[PDB]
Each structure stands twice: as structure tokens, then as C-alpha cells.
Symmetry: C3
């Protein structure tokens, strides 16, 4: 089913979905590499209780990259320059209880552009849902250490200030990587990240990197001063 179409306005109205959906289809006439500052926000709402936030003002590029990693990729068409499918549950649709609903909104859009939302539902229902979190490394700090235990994917900001980045595995060993080594290891799993409308393919973006965290419990980033570095991590948990 179709949810909304946005054109002219820089902010979307708070969109309510009452039917239990399982995936979101984002369509736009701006290519995946052209996205700059559009943000999305999704949460489940209880009528008498507390809301369950899944994504809170997440960059659209990071949201798209955290869901289309693997065999899939963002595709296109003659009319739509970017079509991306993002799964919101594990293997079924969100099981809505007596009074829950879903609320989606889009922020910081471009006036002269078009955005389309669609919802996908399937006969199965499930309780496991995907949650998005964000982590930051300051612009004035040299060495930082973050915990990524329990997360299964990360999108990091590619910046020329990064020099070293070391994983820590569940068995205690620490391995140090460079940006080039990380990019090659990332493209070893998913070679193609998008297919353009005319026919060419793009292997990955020039400023975002995807890291699959498997049996990894810690990350240490070693850089120089100058800029902030952002990680977007994703997890699966029961609501």
C-alpha cells in the first residue's frame, strides 16, 4: 500500500500507519550518492503507555545502507532514481497490540524534489524488531574506544583524518586495520552497492563505509584532530 508522497515542503507531516506493515519502500528522484541531509524517524506508539522508538532522526543514507547490505542493493527505474527496501522486523510483520500504531516522519527535505513512501505487509507476524543507534567521536580527541557488543552492522563516516582502527574479538585478540584494508574487506562481502538507472553500477560511497561486526566486542579508533566521526549501529531485539 502507498503511505505518502512529498513534494514542495521541507518537512513531512507526522504520518500514521494503522495496518501492520513489515517493510518500507523509499523512492526518490535523487540518486543515492546525492543525499545530503534528509533524516527519517520511525516509532511505535501505545495509546496508554510509553512509545517504542526504533529510529530517531537518522540520516537517510545511513538508514538505506544499514538495510540493503548483502545480496540486495538499491535499484532504480526510468522514473524513480532511487528505490530502496528496508526491513523493519525479523521474518514477519510488526504485531500490533490493542492500541499500538506506527508513526513515520521525514525531516530536512529539499523543496524542489520528490519523495515517496510505501508499506509492505506479509502473512506472518513477529515480535523481533530492528533498532538504530548512533555513536560519535569528538573533533578534538585523538584516541577513542567504543563498545559494539551485540550489534551486527555499522556505518562509519569516512574521513581522511582516520589513521588506524583496531577490532577486538570475543577470544581476546586485537587486529589493526587501515582505511584501505577496511574498504577492501567490506567490498569482499558485498561487491555492488547500487545499480544506476542508465546501466552502470557503483561499488560504494565516497564518504560512508559499512562494517559487518561478527564476534566483535570492541573497537578502538586512532585518528588526528579536526572533525567528528559518526557511527550508525543496528541491533535486533524483542519488544
Amino acid at each position: 500500500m502507498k503511505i505518502a508522497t512529498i513534494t514542495g515542503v521541507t518537512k513531512s507531516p507526522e504520518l500514521q500507519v494503522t495496518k501492520a506493515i513489515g517493510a518500507l519502500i523509499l523512492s526518490s528522484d535523487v540518486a543515492l550518492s546525492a543525499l545530503t541531509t534528509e533524516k527519517i524517524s520511525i516509532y511505535i506508539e501505545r495509546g496508554n503507555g510509553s512509545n517504542v522508538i526504533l529510529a530517531n532522526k537518522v540520516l537517510l543514507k545511513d538508514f538505506i545502507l544499514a538495510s540493503t547490505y548483502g545480496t540486495e542493493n538499491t535499484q532504480s527505474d526510468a522514473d524513480n532514481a532511487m528505490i530502496a527496501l528496508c526491513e523493519l522486523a525479523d521474518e514477519g510483520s510488526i504485531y500490533l497490540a490493542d492500541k499500538e500504531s506506527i508513526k513515520i516522519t521525514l525531516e530536512d527535505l529539499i523543496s524542489d524534489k520528490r519523495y515517496d513512501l510505501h508499506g509492505i505487509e506479509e502473512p506472518q507476524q513477529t515480535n523481533n524488531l530492528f533498532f538504530f543507534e548512533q555513536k560519535s567521536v569528538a573533533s578534538e580527541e585523538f584516541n577513542k574506544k567504543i563498545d559494539v557488543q551485540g550489534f551486527d552492522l555499522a556505518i562509519m563516516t569516512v574521513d581522511d583524518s582516520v589513521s588506524d582502527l583496531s577490532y577486538q574479538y570475543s577470544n581476546g585478540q586485537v587486529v589493526k586495520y587501515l582505511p584501505f584494508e577496511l574498504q577492501t574487506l567490506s567490498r569482499d562481502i558485498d561487491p555492488i552497492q547500487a545499480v544506476l538507472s542508465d546501466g552502470k553500477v557503483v561499488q560504494g560511497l565516497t564518504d560512508r563505509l559499512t562494517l559487518p561486526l561478527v564476534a566483535v566486542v570492541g573497537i578502538e579508533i586512532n585518528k588526528s584532530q579536526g572533525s567528528i566521526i559518526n557511527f550508525v549501529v543496528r541491533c535486533l531485539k524483542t519488544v
Copy 2:
């Protein structure tokens, strides 16, 4: 083994294969998008009794698309502008008993083109075979119900007349889809449908769609008048 090459004539001779093959290789100098009305027919002939008909004048585009859905995709070459591999048995080659042979024929060709057939045989022999059937919706009917129980793949003619298409699953639920959602869910599994000779990739034909039917027992199509819609389905069964 090479079966035949066809040029000049609009109709092919009835081609007999006595060696047990397991797959066909179809090659031609016209691109996958340029195939217009070529038809293929395959059947196993028994000495005493009734023949086994696998494909009965099936369109060449649908025959190619029904077999190259998944990891594989139709390839290209400096000499051949279209190469496809179509499997006829599940994991081996057809078991020919004392008085059987396979016969293949091609109909409705073009005079100034070329079509080549090749056979592939395997060390294993099997009894399960692939059958291709055809269902159709006339150009005057509005709403149609089609039984697709037991099938594992379908190919639909993409037309602007089609508005809505609904599945019925094994557990009784009914889900409704738009052509755009169907196309997106289709490309989510197999993103690339063919690779051209110059290097560009094509994710899907502009007039055909491939649908993987998993636990689907019925389809309801809702359209407007103007054209005929065709479904080509494929099943696996023991002979």
C-alpha cells in the same frame, strides 16, 4: 554436444536427441530485449503409449526468464549477443528408458537471424522434471482468479492496464500488491537479470516480471480492459 544451428528459415526441423541431456544452451545474435515471437516446444517421445509434454509452444522470453532467476543471469559474448542456460531436470539428466528420445522444435523465427542449440549432460540421472504451463486473462474481463497451487515460479506480462494483484497464502491470509511493490520485491531477490556485451547491466525487461511463489495457493488479478495478460508457470514433478 551441438544440436543445431538455424538461419534463413522461419521454422526449424524437428530435432531428435537420443543421448540423455540435463540442460539446454540457447544462443542467438539478438539481445534478450529484442526477442519478439520465437516459440519453443520440447517433449519426450515413448515408443508405446502417450508422449510426455514439458513445454508446448512456450514463448522464448518466458522460457529464458523462468530458468535464469537467481544467482545466474543471461550472458553475452563477442560473437553471441545472447547466451542462456535452461535446466530441464532438478539435479541431473532425464532418464531415458528402452524406447524414448527427446525432441525439440522452434517456431515463429526471423529470416535474417541465427539461433543455436546446445545440450548438457550430467553424471547423475533423475526422474523429476520441469513442466511449463500457461494461464491467460482475456482483454475484456475485469477481475480474474487463477490457481497457482503447487507452482514455484511465475512470469507475468507487464501491462499498464493491470492495477492490483492479490495473493492467497497456505494459511488463508490475503495480501494485496501494486505493480511497483511487486517489481521491488522481485528485484530484491535477484537484482541483475542480464549483462550486455558493452558492459552495462539490465535489472529487468520493461514488459515482463518474475514472481517467486512461496506458499501461494491463488492469485487474483484486477485490471481494466485493453489487452491480454499472460502468466507462464513452472512446476517440478515425477514422470
Copy 3:
């Protein structure tokens, strides 16, 4: 880590590595299809008796094609025209004793080109290693029988002399293939071999063919007199 960068000279000095690496990253400003005569050689000196030779002056095209067969492919970037990740161990890192080391060398380079080596280490340590071997068929031999039991992948040099090629499986069955049939079967499993910098893809080189050997015990090669045919095979074994 950065092992070496070679440019301006036609040979590289013997490079020593004392850390336990698991993979190599070969990057260069020449395309995969433009590699002509570069050769690589890797060997580990054990402190205990008997050294290990994993590659004995193997061609770089064959080395790159033998390790990037499957889900991955050789990629590119804005700076480097070819990047390939080649594994030397099964799933861990080559285990070295107190003072053992790995010596790598490159031969028959081009003066006006650039080549970069990188090493990848990973937390697990393993003893299973990948060995590359060279086999040949002379120019005065109508047919030759090659035993490939225990091998899992081969790369053959394409020339017009070959007429057919026969596989012998564990069952005892023999199947005869043609060069075109072999190419189609190979591209069925692996559709894309490399991605170019501009965006176009290449499904395979025009002079090298890659064959996956599964449950294959023997090979027959038939030809007409006049040419020498080269194979490069890979095996996995415990040392």
C-alpha cells in the same frame, strides 16, 4: 599493513614478513585485463625441517583469478585500477614459530607502472594452506590425461587448438564438454569477474577460463598439434 610499493624497477627485492598474515591485497594502476607477464612467488621458511612453497613463479592473472572466484570479485577505486584480495589460508592465519617468516617476491614487472602489497591478519590461526601448481600440455600431444583429485579450482589458457575436454567424476562417468559449453557452465556459477573504475563490469577475461572442479577425479584434453596449453590449479591441504 603496508608490505611494499614497487615502481620504477623491473623486479622487487625479496620481501620478508614476520607477522602471521592470512591474506594478501594486490593493488595496481594497471587493469586486470592489461596484466601480461608479472609473476609472484611466496614461500614460508620453517624453523623446523622442510620449508613450504605456496607459489613458484605463478602468473599474476592466474593468481588473481584463482582467489577471487565466487561471491567476491576484483574491484577498483579512484586511484588504483585493480584491487584484489587473495587468501593464503583457509579461515585463519598462517601459524609461525618463534623466528619463522614468509618471503614474497615479484618478477617481470613494468618500469612505468606501480604495484602495492598489503597483508591481512585475523584472530584465528590455522594450519591448512592453499598451494598453487602449474601443469602443461606440450605442442606435440594429441591428448593428455591430468589427475586432479584433491583440487578444487583450475585456470586454463584459452586457444583455438582445443576441440573438447572430458571430466571423470567419482562415480566413474565421463562427460565431454566443448570450450563454449565450459564457458557457459563457468559463467552460470560466477556471472561477474571484475568491476571497472568507470562502472562497467566484465564477466571474464577473453584468454583465461576458470573451472570449478567438484567431485572431479580426472581430466582429458584433446587438441590438434601446434600449441602448448597451460593450467594453474589450486589445492588446500594441512601442513
